[PDB]
Structures are given as structure tokens and as C-alpha cells.
Write a protein that binds this ligand. Sequence first.
Ligand SMILES: Cn1c(O)c(Cc2cccc(Cl)c2)c(N2CCOCC2)nc1=O
Length: 134
Amino acid sequence: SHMCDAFVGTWKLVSSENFDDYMKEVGVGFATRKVAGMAKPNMIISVNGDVITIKSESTFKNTEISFILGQEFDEVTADDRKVKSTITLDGGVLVHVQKWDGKSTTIKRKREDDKLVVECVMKGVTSTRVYERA
Ligand SMILES: Cn1c(O)c(Cc2cccc(Cl)c2)c(N2CCOCC2)nc1=O
């Protein structure tokens, strides 16, 4: 109860850094990188009991995940990877690990001032995606 309150809401992308390089490291192909890199998603986060839902809506792709913290689930990512994901809360940060084909990437979401800051890491490459309230 009240675990993720400060995440709940409707958020819009305001800045991005190094996302194309992150996508390259993940294995995303040229055309998907270009179209996906243009997107300005909204991220809609809600909680109902133990179930957290994160929706992403953009002109590129609309996706939605629902999950319970610590409980693995199957996810098809916007770039069409079929991954096994687990999301946990670590010191106030939502930590989302995706595993596929012997690879792994981690997406961290944290509240910083009035922003929701998303850090995506694949090996040595980090992208930072900043969202603000819609
Ligand atoms: C944190 N984050 C994110 O995880 C994705 C999904 C994603 C991950 C890896 C490769 C790709 Cl192509 C897309 C994202 N996209 C949502 C769909 O429209 C394009 C932007 N924006 C983000 O801020």
C-alpha cells in the first residue's frame, strides 16, 4: 500500500540523451531506431492493489505492462524483443531487468524533483530519458 505513489500519473517525455546509442547496443535496427527515436511518449503509471501498470503511448508504438514487484513476466518490447522481465523497488527506484537471448538490460525509474528520470543501461551505454507531468 502506497509503495509507488510518487510514480503514479501521466508523464510526457521532455528530454533524451544517448537513446540512439542505447538502442544500438540493444540490437535495434536502423529504421526502428530512427522512428522510435522521434517519438515523444507519454508514460501512464497506475497502481491497483499489488498490480502496477505502466503504459507507453506514442506515435511509434503503444505498449502496456502490468506486474507485481519481484514476480517475473513475459514482455514484448516496443522494438519487438521477447523478453523475461522482473521489476523491483530498490530504495525508492523502480528497477526493471529484461533478459533475452543471453543478454540483459536494466531500466531504472526514479523521482527527482518534479521529474521522472528513466535511465536505460545496456553494458557500458546509458541513456537518460526525462519525463515531466502531463
Ligand atoms: C524508457 N523508454 C523505453 O523503455 C522505451 C521503449 C524502448 C526500449 C528499447 C528500444 C525501443 Cl525502440 C523502445 C521508449 N520508447 C517507447 C516507444 O516509443 C519509442 C520510445 N521510450 C522510453 O523512454
